[PDB]
Design a protein around this ligand. Structure first.
Ligand SMILES: Nc1ncnc2c1ncn2[C@@H]1O[C@H](COP(=O)(O)OP(=O)(O)OP(O)(O)=S)[C@@H](O)[C@H]1O
Ligand SMILES: Nc1ncnc2c1ncn2[C@@H]1O[C@H](COP(=O)(O)OP(=O)(O)OP(O)(O)=S)[C@@H](O)[C@H]1O
Ligand SMILES: Nc1ncnc2c1ncn2[C@@H]1O[C@H](COP(=O)(O)OP(=O)(O)OP(O)(O)=S)[C@@H](O)[C@H]1O
Ligand SMILES: [Mg+2]
Ligand SMILES: [Mg+2]
Lengths: 268, 455, 114, 114
């Protein structure tokens, strides 16, 4: 017990706990791992699985939770719904997980709150008033305020990926600590174009292409017809999910070839 | 030449006495010879390492890694200086206290494993009789298992109960046997007991324990086979051999009474008939190697469990119907984890291929093609030993290295005097080579030290 | 807002009972108030960390290191995933069993030191 | 095309095409094929077929270790070689096995390899 040294009563107190923490975490480092939290209304599960598959191309062990179950790498770790904070502790406590991808449902936030303090990346897909009156959420403004928890809980060096075509989601641009990255299926969105002129990090679908805008530069990923999930570019709902999935990992420094390889081989 | 120091000294002392007696009287009494031989055997057995640590030392010698025996708690040290490791039997110097303490706690281990999604048996705890019936519908019905919270050698634990009165009597037995009056009840899982060895987060060997049994394929009954098996050279007692003699105990007699047959009842068609159901090697069961038949998903799950508990060498008990299928399709469960397992059953399976567990332990302790050696400079001569030793140490100190050197003035480790006196014999060289901070060793080797105790 | 989960739930349950009693009778018995306060103090003392582990947790919070409480043996886990560490009171997950056992043995420790 | 090789494999020597150049005997063919085996550095390995008397005869005049492979698990030369040292490969019971002395390491069942 070192507690006789923190209050000597006849001398200078010593910071023993500081030494213990310097031994456990040597440098200017904490015990954090990249966390990507996906929220929205419609495409949470598909985006979560696509993000996990893209990250798996890098030699990393990815733990992710969706509605189907909780996966750690290639093997199913738990069955059930598993979209609440109680299933996020299984991922963050595994001694083999290096990146965490979490589908954060609305019921989990309402019931017990969020399963962590800060996230490296927060993705908001869309807010749509389809099921209402549950609990005390009876207005689309309250639904947006509830979904905004993921966006507002982003560390200052993190990123918030937002949909530029949703007036409610884009309105979450304020009260966000950290950079904001917009994605849009319309290449002529005035908000996105104005955002790229001073800064950048947007993602668009311009001419049968999935493009990343880093300011005045355009980086084309794929032709959107070689991606199986788009069904030769016929389903417009899938391209919106692919844009968010690619933009989320681009802000984290993942190479373009890894993104392309992961997107070209993902199967539903 | 000697193999044991005390035994060699005793034999040397006894040889001259025997020669004096035989030249004085013409013969030596046989009783004195028997006394001397039994004394020598006692000395040999007194200074002997355990069956696991000797197997590890044999691999260490084969790889050319120096090893010494510390005098504290039967610990063995491999290597020199800053490259040393310590083992006791199977525990290494990197095995954590928290992992061992958690593994020794059955109830906390089960909770931790369940929180991580590992399939564990579904159970409940109870301290009063009125609660018992309640737990019965919680576990899901019958059969159930009644066990105490804390017990050794399986005190007051039943295996299979299917009705009320047997459950009540087993509960009473466990409650009076448990030190805390409380009793756990689990669901009973049918299957074959498996013992998995995990070293450094990798599965090394898998063995299935088949309970002590006899097969009447030779048109012979139990009464002859019980002693026929006991006459096999593979069977032995102690802590060295897997296969123990088939103990026909009163409890064993009752168990074979519950079998439904008799001593002279010939087995039908030549089918296995068991003597006990605990599936343990101490009873007299056998082990069957299954390392090549394990499913990759089971390997991943067991490797994850070993890291979750926090053990570098672990022995996991599994109950499943087939190890070649994932533990989800079949209702397989993880029963317990042991912190300091004995790999004695994996090196002599008796029905399969032997595995090199000691090789894995050495590969964990010394990863690459490396040994635990440090540069050693031995200076000898007649006149200038001390000055040369000090000059060598001073020259090496210019490189950023900690130098331990022994001369006639004393034994130094770096810049501070570590021991005073002459300190030029082999007894002062052990202090330098055992320090966990020495990188280079410089030794003045005097003539008297070589003459007295060697190098 | 609460500091302890059980204590907060107990206080929330007791507040409505106190309000109902005071609106029904005009006052609340002092003995019941003392009982409620002593029960709250008991819940506060029940779920409390030791003087050493709380001091370590205070530094961990100041450095921005996440910390959770495992349910096994009063162990605390710092960090996430492959970067996690565990402490019980002052023992860490890297403290060796052999060292602790040797330190607990006075006579062997003296021989080794000599 | 080089001076020294880390691994030199000799599969078999069979007199099937002859009369080319100055090679007119299976002994000359073996002497010619022995160039690969003899040009192995002292820390290298020479992999040889134990079932061919001519290839096995290249065991001498080889600098570096020798590793035998055989389709017959009861080859006396290979078994005697494993008793003192090791590094052999056999096909024992529908298995592709590596013998590292007294230890057997099974690779595959030889029916799952296309
Ligand atoms: N961006 C999108 N916009 C609108 N509809 C979408 C979008 N993405 C997917 N959908 C539709 O929503 C359906 C369900 O989406 P999922 O892939 O299951 O995501 P999900 O929200 O996790 O599912 P839930 O919440 O368990 S119903 C899909 O089959 C599509 O038909
Ligand atoms: N749910 C279960 N289903 C099937 N077999 C079980 C089950 N629970 C326990 N067993 C068996 O009973 C044994 C109990 O473990 P033990 O090692 O005997 O525990 P113990 O009381 O600590 O005795 P020791 O001292 O460790 S040998 C297991 O090894 C299994 O063979
Ligand atoms: N190479 C040498 N040849 C002859 N005499 C020497 C040599 N080196 C040293 N001496 C002499 O021997 C004396 C004693 O040598 P030391 O430097 O003490 O080495 P030492 O052999 O360890 O001393 P000892 O064994 O304890 S007497 C020195 O003071 C010199 O006078
Ligand atoms: Mg879903
Ligand atoms: Mg001298």
């Amino acid at each position: 017990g070192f507690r006789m040294h923190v209050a000597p009563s006849r001398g200078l107190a010593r910071n023993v706990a500081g030494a213990v923490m310097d031994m456990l975490f040597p440098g200017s480092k904490n015990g954090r791992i990249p966390i990507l939290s996906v929220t929205g209304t419609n495409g949470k599960t598909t985006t979560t699985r696509l993000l996990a598959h893209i990250i798996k191309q890098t030699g990393k062990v990815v733990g992710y939770t969706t509605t189907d179950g909780t996966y750690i790498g290639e093997y199913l770790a738990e069955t059930g719904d598993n979209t609440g904070p109680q299933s996020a502790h299984l991922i963050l406590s595994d001694p083999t997980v290096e990146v965490a991808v979490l589908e954060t449902a609305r019921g989990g936030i309402l019931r017990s709150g969020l399963g962590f303090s800060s996230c490296e990346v927060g993705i908001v897909l869309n807010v749509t008033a389809d099921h209402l009156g549950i609990g005390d959420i009876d207005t689309i403004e309250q639904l947006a305020k509830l979904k905004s928890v993921v966006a507002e809980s982003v560390m200052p060096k993190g990123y918030a990926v937002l949909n530029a075509e949703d007036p409610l989601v884009a309105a979450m641009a304020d009260r966000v600590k950290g950079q904001v990255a917009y994605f849009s299926m319309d290449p002529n969105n005035e908000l996105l174009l104005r955002h790229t002129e001073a800064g950048g990090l947007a993602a668009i679908y311009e001419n049968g292409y999935i493009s990343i805008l880093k300011g005045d530069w355009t980086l084309r990923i794929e032709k959107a017809v070689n991606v199986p999930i788009t069904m030769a570019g016929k389903a417009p709902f899938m391209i919106a999910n692919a844009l968010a999935a690619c933009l989320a990992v681009f802000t984290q420094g993942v190479k373009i070839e890894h993104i392309r390889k992961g997107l070209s081989t993902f199967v539903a | 030449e000697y193999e044991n120091e005390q035994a060699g000294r005793y034999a040397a002392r006894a040889a001259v006495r025997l020669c004096q007696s035989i030249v004085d009287t013409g013969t030596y009494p046989a009783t004195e010879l028997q006394q001397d031989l039994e004394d020598l055997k006692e000395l040999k057995n007194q200074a002997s390492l355990g069956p696991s640590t000797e197997a590890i030392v044999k691999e260490a010698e084969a790889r050319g890694i120096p090893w010494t025996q510390l005098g504290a708690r039967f610990m063995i040290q491999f290597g020199y200086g800053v490259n040393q490791k310590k083992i006791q039997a199977t525990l290494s110097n990197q095995t954590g206290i928290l992992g061992v303490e958690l593994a020794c706690d059955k109830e906390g281990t089960k909770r931790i494993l369940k929180d991580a999604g590992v399939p564990v048996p579904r159970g409940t705890v109870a301290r009063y009789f009125d609660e018992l019936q309640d737990a019965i519908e919680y576990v899901g019905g019958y059969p159930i298992v009644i066990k105490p919270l804390d017990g050794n050698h399986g005190r007051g634990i039943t295996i299979d109960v299917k009705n009320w009165q047997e459950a009540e009597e087993a509960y009473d037995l466990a409650r009076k046997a448990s030190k805390t009056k409380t009793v756990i009840v689990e669901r009973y899982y049918t299957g074959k007991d498996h013992r998995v060895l995990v070293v450094n987060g990798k599965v090394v060997a898998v063995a299935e324990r088949v309970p002590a049994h006899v097969v009447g394929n030779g048109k012979s009954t139990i009464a002859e086979l019980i002693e026929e098996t006991n006459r096999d050279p593979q069977r032995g007692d102690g802590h060295d051999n897997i296969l123990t003699r088939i103990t026909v105990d009163k409890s064993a007699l009752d168990i074979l009474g519950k079998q439904g047959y008799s001593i002279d009842s010939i087995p039908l068609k030549g089918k296995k008939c068991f003597l006990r159901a605990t599936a343990n090697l101490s009873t007299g069961g056998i082990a069957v190697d299954r390392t090549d038949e394990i499913h990759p998903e089971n390997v991943w799950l067991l490797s994850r469990v070993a890291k979750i508990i926090g053990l570098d060498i672990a022995g996991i008990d599994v109950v499943t119907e087939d190890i070649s299928q994932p533990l989800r399709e079949v209702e397989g469960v993880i029963v317990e984890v042991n912190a300091a397992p004995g790999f004695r059953m994996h090196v002599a399976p008796s029905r399969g291929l032997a595995r090199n567990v000691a090789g894995a332990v050495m590969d964990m302790l010394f990863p690459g093609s490396k040994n635990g050696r440090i540069p050693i400079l031995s200076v000898t001569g007649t006149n200038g030993k001390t000055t040369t030793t000090r000059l060598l140490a001073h020259i090496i100190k210019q490189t950023g290295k900690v130098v331990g050197y022994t001369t006639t003035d004393g034994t130094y480790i770096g810049e501070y005097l570590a021991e005073t006196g002459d300190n030029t014999g082999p007894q002062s060289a052990h202090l330098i080579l055992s320090d966990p901070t020495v990188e280079v060793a410089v030794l003045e080797t005097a003539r008297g030290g070589i003459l007295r105790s060697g190098l």
